Design a protein around this ligand. Structure first.
Ligand code: HEM
Ligand code: HEM
Ligand SMILES: O=C(N[C@H](CS[C@@H](Cc1ccccc1)C(=O)NCCCc1cccnc1)Cc1cccc2ccccc12)c1cccnc1
Ligand SMILES: O=C(N[C@H](CS[C@@H](Cc1ccccc1)C(=O)NCCCc1cccnc1)Cc1cccc2ccccc12)c1cccnc1
Lengths: 430, 430
């Protein structure tokens, strides 16, 4: 508990840290409730300890703009060190400084407006596998676990949008994937596990055997290793499955508990796409209410909850001294629910993002995809992927609450932003 | 042994590393013999592994100038990480990047030509305690352990040149101070010990109680903490004792085994200082042969043996790619004995440093005090301290080999550059 006097010195409020543990016992209600409580207890700026690690929480939109944008390349370049990783240290999400800058430029032309438009005719296939897999569980009046049929779709998308492998995700899906804590109170142990190779060889040799003799194309086309190829593929595999399915489950819960929004969305889909027209790249972007629903759900459920940057050297941002080594954190979940910015923040209201009202929204308060040079590189792909899925599903089915549907939806009091009970809804055919 | 293929990839020769251990088993003859052997086996550039840590050895004087001078602030700023340290991480010798740059500027005016000239009237006291402590062990024909009477002098110097405490170092000296290895093959364990406070509180509270209510003066006069004061004091205490005594023992051994040089030096001392005149700041600098003896001894015995810098990012120096994280090492001991630069290098010959021959010496081959911005900050003080001691001792005593004198002198086959057996010589009074 030696370094537990930093914020007392700097005159920054926060919860009193216990020795060794710091303030980690306060995570018993989850990161979200802890951040929402501290945002009320200490105001605009406070600090806590993840073990011996000082973490300063900031809410000033100017100070957030400074960290994420103005001083990204200079001071706030990297996220919190995460280990043990092994060869995955070369992943773009985990790499640091110059190595990250080289990876960012190398992987950036994957999600251009042109490369995304090339994927719309490809994504349109598994949307029909998604509907037909749902039409079976709908003609039988059997409630549907959404994350299963969504994850089956989300897995089909990422394997082909990046590589080209086509699999109906109801036969054998070759893609499998607590203790993830303790690292906080035992980071000294991270370099320890850095050597006993505790990092499966499943795609470590299978994806490594991407002989191919797309994102896989533009890579072999400084330079990039074939393993540097494996680690990035795993990263792009991580997001496009779990994030895509979890948000789509979050959307259908809110569309089920708010039937008025679900119908108003179905009316717009039939308008832009008459006769159940196939969704194209440009017709998806025309739908504004679909964008408002996705934006409002991501406000209530920012699947990242927090944004983090490591302060690599002493700085004085927006009139506040911040010492080297301190982790700067932006409580995305708490800011998305801050009543000082959102009227009735717990209520699902897509009209916050109407073009009449989308101007009263600060882009450093609503940050579902981060901000600055190190934002979510797969943002445009993710939004398009989820929107292409919502259109084809709502064009065919309507969703109603079931007997076993968790109303209201508890968030996972544990680590990652998921529901406690899975989202099960009744599916009816139009 | 995963990272044991770096030099095989780069096409750089070196000894084959065993798993986990790397090449540390080759240290069984000491760093010096290992460096001298590898300098012959692989030529101008080679690499080895300190456990899993790659260390690239360079001998090209241009590449040495690049690392130590041209690219010091940019790439080669810090030495190898050393731990566990505790609060001593703020020491100038251990600090890194900006924190070191702030410490360097803050402590640099301590060893100016003016501040050194203020210490000559102060150092002249304990030189007489050194002579009188020797005159007792000389009027009794009892051989003298040099490092005892030298360390007693060297301890008297550092306590007053920096603080002002006066003690005859034959009563109780309040200054006490293997496993130091393993860190190489167990650095993962360094952050581990970083928390169980394995770093005595002896001067940690005594020197901390430097109420004083000099180097201590110029400190309280960005800013500097009072603990930042303790750590630096300990650093300055480390060098001025052990380094000063060990080199003075190295000099008297060579002056004893080479009586012709010892007399030619005594003749110059009586010339510049007739009637055993007290040595002053300017009379010490006039003595060239005294400088040549000190320089030649430091060639045969560079007490640091090696210079090291951590390559903080990918670079291509003098036409050689060097990857991030690699430790760049300059084998000072091996270069000081390189026959490609020195004629009969094992032979003590102060005439190498005569002004007729001091021009045939490359300053990036002879580096007893390092080079560049991070050179030995206490160089000018150390040379003056040792020279002020040699003058007053040789003005009174002559030294001859004894029965138990180790001839030839074995170097310590262990870690730090010391003799195996201590240097014991017979002392006679002129
Ligand atoms: C609803 C979907 C998604 C959300 C809400 C989301 C959110 C985020 C957030 C908050 C960050 C951190 C930004 C920061 O710290 O400033 C991030 C980073 C990242 N995202 Fe996503 N993400 C989503 C989907 C995806 C997808 C489909 C990909 C496909 C490759 C992806 C790839 C990445 C990568 C590689 C990073 C690391 C960026 C870097 O380190 O340069 N994400 N994402
Ligand atoms: C015969 C006497 C001495 C020798 C041969 C010697 C040698 C060296 C060497 C080789 C280095 C490393 C240079 C490099 O890596 O480039 C160094 C650094 C250093 N020396 Fe000495 N030294 C001696 C005495 C002293 C004394 C009396 C002091 C008094 C304060 C001192 C203070 C330091 C410090 C603080 C550093 C670290 C420099 C930095 O990190 O900026 N040394 N010395
Ligand atoms: O990713 C989850 N935990 C991460 C751990 S780091 C790493 C994952 C990893 C790589 C190699 C070995 C072991 C693990 C990573 O590359 N992760 C972002 C990639 C997908 C992605 C995910 C989300 C948004 N966008 C892209 C921390 C984290 C959480 C949340 C948001 C983050 C945002 C940025 C960086 C780290 C973030 C995770 C979460 C839930 C289920 N499964 C895994
Ligand atoms: O210092 C010796 N071991 C060092 C270890 S790091 C540190 C010492 C320390 C600080 C705080 C906690 C524990 C240890 C240090 O501050 N050390 C240079 C200071 C004196 C000094 C010494 C020599 C020259 N000039 C100044 C590595 C090293 C060796 C040799 C030369 C180096 C040169 C530069 C940096 C590290 C060097 C050591 C050696 C022999 C006996 N006793 C201790």
């Amino acid at each position: 508990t030696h370094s537990h006097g930093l914020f007392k010195k700097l005159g920054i409020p926060g919860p009193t840290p216990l020795p060794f543990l710091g303030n980690i016992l306060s995570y018993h209600k989850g990161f979200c409730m802890f951040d929402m409580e501290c945002h009320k207890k200490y105001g605009k700026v406070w600090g806590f300890y993840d073990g011996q690690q000082p973490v300063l929480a900031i809410t000033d939109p100017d100070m957030i703009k400074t960290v994420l944008v103005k001083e990204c390349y200079s001071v706030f370049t990297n996220r919190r060190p995460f280990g043990p990783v092994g060869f995955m240290k070369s992943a773009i999400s985990i790499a640091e400084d110059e190595e990250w800058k080289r990876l960012r430029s190398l992987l950036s032309p994957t999600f251009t407006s042109g490369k995304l438009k090339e994927m719309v005719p490809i994504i349109a296939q598994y949307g029909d596998v998604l509907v037909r897999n749902l039409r079976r569980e709908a003609e039988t009046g059997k409630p549907v676990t959404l994350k299963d049929v969504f994850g089956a779709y989300s897995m089909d998308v990422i394997t082909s949008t990046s590589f080209g492998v086509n699999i109906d995700s109801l036969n054998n899906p070759q893609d499998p994937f607590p203790f993830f804590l303790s690292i906080t109170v035992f980071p000294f142990l991270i370099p320890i596990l850095e050597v006993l190779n505790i990092c499966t060889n499943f795609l470590r040799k299978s994806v490594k055997r991407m002989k191919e003799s797309d994102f896989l194309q533009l890579m072999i086309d400084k330079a990039l290793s074939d393993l540097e190829l494996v680690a990035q593929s795993i990263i792009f595999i991580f997001a496009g499955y779990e994030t895509t399915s979890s948000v789509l489950s979050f959307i259908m819960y809110e569309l089920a508990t708010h039937p008025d929004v679900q119908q108003k969305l179905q009316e717009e889909i039939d308008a832009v796409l008459p006769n159940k027209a196939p969704p194209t790249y440009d017709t998806v972007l025309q739908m504004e209410y679909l964008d408002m629903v996705v934006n409002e759900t991501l406000r209530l459920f920012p699947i990242a909850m927090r944004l983090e940057r490591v302060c690599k050297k002493d700085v004085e941002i927006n009139g506040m001294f911040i010492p080297k080594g301190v982790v700067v954190m932006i409580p995305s979940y708490a800011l998305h629910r801050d009543p000082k910015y959102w009227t009735e923040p717990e209520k699902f209201l897509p009209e916050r993002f109407s073009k009449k009202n989308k101007d009263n929204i600060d882009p450093y308060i609503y940050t579902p995809f981060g901000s600055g040079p190190r934002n979510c590189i797969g943002m445009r792909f993710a939004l398009m992927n989820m929107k292409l899925a919502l259109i084809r599903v709502l064009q065919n089915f309507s969703f109603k609450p079931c007997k076993e549907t968790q109303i209201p939806l508890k968030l996972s009091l544990g680590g990652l932003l998921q529901p406690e009970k899975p989202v099960v809804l009744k599916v009816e055919s139009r």
